[PDB]
Amino acid sequence: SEESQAFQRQLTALIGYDVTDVSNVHDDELEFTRRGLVTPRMAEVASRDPKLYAMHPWVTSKPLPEYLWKKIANNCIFIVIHRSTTSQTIKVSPDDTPGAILQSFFTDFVLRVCGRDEYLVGETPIKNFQWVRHCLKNGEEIHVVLDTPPDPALDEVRKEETVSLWDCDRKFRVKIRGIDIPVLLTVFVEANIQHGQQVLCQRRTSPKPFTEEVLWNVWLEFSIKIKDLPKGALLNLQIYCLLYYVNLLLIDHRFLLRRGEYVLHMWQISGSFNADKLTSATNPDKENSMSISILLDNYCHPIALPKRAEMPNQLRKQLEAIIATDPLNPLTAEDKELLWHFRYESLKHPKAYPKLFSSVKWGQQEIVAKTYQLLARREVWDQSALDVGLTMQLLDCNFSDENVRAIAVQKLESLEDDDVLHYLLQLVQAVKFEPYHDSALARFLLKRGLRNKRIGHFLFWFLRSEIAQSRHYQQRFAVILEAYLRGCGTAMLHDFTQQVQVIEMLQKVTLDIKSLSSSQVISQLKQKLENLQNSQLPESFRVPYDPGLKAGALAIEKCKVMASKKKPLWLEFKCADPTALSNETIGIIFKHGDDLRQDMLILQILRIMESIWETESLDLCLLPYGCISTGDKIGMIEIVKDATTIAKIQQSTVGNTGAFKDEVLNHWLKEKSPTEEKFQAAVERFVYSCAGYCVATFVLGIGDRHNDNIMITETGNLFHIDFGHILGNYERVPFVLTPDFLFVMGTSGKKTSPHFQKFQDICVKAYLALRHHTNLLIILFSMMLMTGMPQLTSKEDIEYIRDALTVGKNEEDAKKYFLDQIEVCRDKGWTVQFNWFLHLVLG
Numbered sequence: 001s002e003e004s005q006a007f008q009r010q011l012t013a014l015i016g017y018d019v020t021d022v023s024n025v026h027d028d029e030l031e032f033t034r035r036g037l038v039t040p041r042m043a044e045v046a047s048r049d050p051k052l053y054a055m056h057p058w059v060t061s062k063p064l065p066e067y068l069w070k071k072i073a074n075n076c077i078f079i080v081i082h083r084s085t086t087s088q089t090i091k092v093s094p095d096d097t098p099g100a101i102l103q104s105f106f107t108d109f110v111l112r113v114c115g116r117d118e119y120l121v122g123e124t125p126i127k128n129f130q131w132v133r134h135c136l137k138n139g140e141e142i143h144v145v146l147d148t149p150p151d152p153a154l155d156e157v158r159k160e161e162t163v164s165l166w167d168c169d170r171k172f173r174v175k176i177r178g179i180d181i182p183v184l185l186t187v188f189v190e191a192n193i194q195h196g197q198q199v200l201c202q203r204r205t206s207p208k209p210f211t212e213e214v215l216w217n218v219w220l221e222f223s224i225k226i227k228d229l230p231k232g233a234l235l236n237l238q239i240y241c242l243l244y245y246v247n248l249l250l251i252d253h254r255f256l257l258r259r260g261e262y263v264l265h266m267w268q269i270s271g272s273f274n275a276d277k278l279t280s281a282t283n284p285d286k287e288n289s290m291s292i293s294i295l296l297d298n299y300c301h302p303i304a305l306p307k308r309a310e311m312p313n314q315l316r317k318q319l320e321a322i323i324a325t326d327p328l329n330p331l332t333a334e335d336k337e338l339l340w341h342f343r344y345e346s347l348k349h350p351k352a353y354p355k356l357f358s359s360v361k362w363g364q365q366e367i368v369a370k371t372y373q374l375l376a377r378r379e380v381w382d383q384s385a386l387d388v389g390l391t392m393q394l395l396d397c398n399f400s401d402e403n404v405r406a407i408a409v410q411k412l413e414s415l416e417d418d419d420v421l422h423y424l425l426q427l428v429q430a431v432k433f434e435p436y437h438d439s440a441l442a443r444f445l446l447k448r449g450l451r452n453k454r455i456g457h458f459l460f461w462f463l464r465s466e467i468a469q470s471r472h473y474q475q476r477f478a479v480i481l482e483a484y485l486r487g488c489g490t491a492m493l494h495d496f497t498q499q500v501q502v503i504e505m506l507q508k509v510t511l512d513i514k515s516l517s518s519s520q521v522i523s524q525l526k527q528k529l530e531n532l533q534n535s536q537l538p539e540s541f542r543v544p545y546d547p548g549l550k551a552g553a554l555a556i557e558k559c560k561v562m563a564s565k566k567k568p569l570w571l572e573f574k575c576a577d578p579t580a581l582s583n584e585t586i587g588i589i590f591k592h593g594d595d596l597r598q599d600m601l602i603l604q605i606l607r608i609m610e611s612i613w614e615t616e617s618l619d620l621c622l623l624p625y626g627c628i629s630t631g632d633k634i635g636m637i638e639i640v641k642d643a644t645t646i647a648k649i650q651q652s653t654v655g656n657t658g659a660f661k662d663e664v665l666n667h668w669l670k671e672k673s674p675t676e677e678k679f680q681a682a683v684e685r686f687v688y689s690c691a692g693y694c695v696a697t698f699v700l701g702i703g704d705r706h707n708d709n710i711m712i713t714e715t716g717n718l719f720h721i722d723f724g725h726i727l728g729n730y731e732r733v734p735f736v737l738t739p740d741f742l743f744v745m746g747t748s749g750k751k752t753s754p755h756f757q758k759f760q761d762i763c764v765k766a767y768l769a770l771r772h773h774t775n776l777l778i779i780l781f782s783m784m785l786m787t788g789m790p791q792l793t794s795k796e797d798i799e800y801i802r803d804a805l806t807v808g809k810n811e812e813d814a815k816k817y818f819l820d821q822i823e824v825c826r827d828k829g830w831t832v833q834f835n836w837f838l839h840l841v842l843g
């Protein structure tokens with residue numbers, strides 16, 4: 001067709017990358033995976049109920065926590081329904097199915113929410129809708145417009161149409177031809193054979209003078225049999241004088257050993273591991289890039305990779321100990337041989353699977369074969385409750401064997417939609433650790449993407465973000481994105497199209513205003529925004545960070561540039577939907593020069609932390625506001641309404657002095673409060689709020705923060721920001737509990753009011769709570785550093801979280817450690833803020 005020829009052109013511009021392209025391939029793996037995904041794509045579209053997929057209800061099957069019962073009158077919730085303008089309130093029991101909240105209204109139509117693209121459809125108790133649980137949380141009313149179901153019709157999709165390797169015993173070899181750099185020391189080539197960050201054999205070449213061309217024509221023989229190469233092995237070519245690297249999967253997506261001639265353009269190094277370094281893709285920029293030439297031996301060569309007693313006592317106990325230690329504590333050789341010999345005993349403990357499958361010599365045919373027999377007894381893994389920390393450790397950079405990995409992905413299949421949303425950003429980042437383009441995990445992101453409009457909206461932007469600012473991974477991601485778009489359904493396809501149009505204009509607008517860097521500038525911003533508001537910028541569009549919110553007309557009146565070194569737009573929008581209950585605009589900040597990738601990661605851990613605390617019935621009140629990375633150093637940011645920097649509340653009654661007054665904040669609070677009484681709450685909300693960030697900030701190692709980088713709301717709730725900075729470009733304090741926050745709490749100097757005793761008892765139940773998940777957080781945090789924090793890994797950075805979560809110690813030993821922490825705050829007072837000020841305001 002040709003409606004299959006122009007189509008490919010919209011998809012390509014939705015993606016922001018041309019997949020069909022070929023200038024930076026050296027084989028057909030990607031196309032192979034495009035081919036491949038067609039089936040899981042069509043398998044899920046065919047299989048999703050067009051009804052529920054149309055209204056994408058947002059259900060949750062977890063218990064409605066404590067604080068939200070102790071917030072109900074009694075077994076009675078209230079839901080204001082709206083028609084023409086004739087309102088109406090109704091009684092409803094927390095277990096009231098939605099449709100009944102109509103068979104209880106007429107005694108054809110589906111309940112929507114007011115303002116939002118959020119329906120309350122489907123066979124679920126209301127107790128269990130997120131919006132509801134959201135009203136309950138912040139205490140608002142539940143407003144529905146009884147209106148007409150969307151048309152599945154609109155989600156319809158466009159129309160679609162040898163000698164085995166275990167025979168061969170010769171040490172595997174690769175010939176170097178040499179390298180060549182079109183623009184400039186001695187220099188050697190390093191040729192490692194890797195698997196899952198294990199290094200099997202290793203060779204190099206004689207040094208050389210560093211010249212515009214260098215040739216060796218050597219052969220590097222390895223100490224690895226051909227038959228001992230494991231599926232997922234990388235030839236890793238490197239160049240020292242370290243300067244350039246590049247990789248080649250020795251065994252290919254077709255299970256064939258790689259023989260042939262290869263001209264790979266090679267990746268520079270900026271400035272000890274880091275997810276780009278793992279990539280099977282090659283540098284596109286040829287005119288500039290170093291390159292290396294090799295020969296993989298040939299002939300033929302179709303090859304061809306195919307497919308208990310008892311136990312002492314000190315040993316069992318040595319073994320129980322090993323299973324016990326955290327994900328980061330390293331396995332000695334004594335440890336590994338121990339895990340392996342008693343592997344059948346190690347298989348009974350899912351907790352042992354990461355450590356056990358890392359004791360495997362993947363460079364040995366027979367061992368892998370044995371390991372694969374180990375996976376065939378996987379019944380105890382299979383039965384156990386899903387444990388995401390455990391499931392994550394087998395998906396990291398340490399496991400390169402798709403069988404192992406696949407059983408983690410099997411364990412994810414059983415996450416409810418609610419939880420995919422919690423781990424989606426990092427599961428998507430997890431794709432970078434997959435040796436091959438098509439994977440159980442790449443397919444699982446596809447399935448879940450296609451089965452739910454909310455996961456698929458976020459999957460879209462997460463992937464789109466990576467595509468745009470990572471040339472190491474765009475190819476593979478672009479292929480996954482494309483597969484998504486070919487089956488989300490015209491409707492959303494059209495929606496994604498509005499969103500990309502709008503947010504691509506606002507970006508050049510933003511970069512533009514930045515370039516003109518004042519009275520002479522407030523003018524242009526107001527001027528361009530009219531242009532766009534004229535014809536091109538379509539009427540509305542989903543807010544990318546909040547898929548349920550459609551933004552309508554701008555409001556040039558309120559928009560502006562800002563007094564940052566860089567010049568971020570403070571744009572404000574009208575809600576595009578009439579049914580809205582209020583008239584508060586929608587506020588977004590476009591900014592160039594922050595790596596918002598890091599804020600995404602950090603913000604997302606924060607939500608996971610809010611979710612951990614919920615299992616234990618706490619609520620520490622965080623504001624992990626929306627944030628979407630759209631390109632390199634560029635993206636947008638939700639604006640929390642009614643909030644200021646803490647510094648600003650200092651600049652208020654002191655003003656560019658830094659003579660910080662221990663009292664201004666509790667002042668700012670009353671001034672803003674409607675009463676004294678609600679004001680108590682703006683004190684209460686602060687207590688929790690503050691401890692909440694104190695602990696998470698401390699655990700993540702981003703608690704030693706600057707005063708402009710903390711914020712608060714006229715209604716009490718406090719929250720950090722701009723996490724890009726710190727771990728994004730980087731005499732101390734653990735977190736930040738300033739005399740201001742203390743003063744609000746009732747304490748002064750060496751006194752100890754009650755509210756603060758509370759703050760403490762919160763900082764202690766909360767801090768201990770996260771430690772009940774040491775493993776999960778360590779793996780989240782450890783994957784963040786590798787995939788999101790460039791150059792700042794080393795591992796010595798990764799280990800930090802170990803100390804903070806205080807692995808080893810008992811709860812008692814723990815409750816203390818953190819109160820001592822809280823104490824370094826009370827003892828350091830202002831030294832540091834005042835210190836940061838002397839620094840960040842002048843230096």
Ligand SMILES: CNc1nc(C)c2cc(-c3cccc(CO)c3)c(=O)n(C3CCCC3)c2n1
Nearest residue numbers: 599625627637638639640641643721722723724
């Ligand atoms: C008004 N409320 C309000 N809400 C929010 C969420 C923000 C967020 C950022 C912000 C800035 C950079 C990175 C990130 C991502 O970590 C967030 C921000 O800079 N500001 C203001 C402080 C200086 C002027 C703008 C905010 N202000």
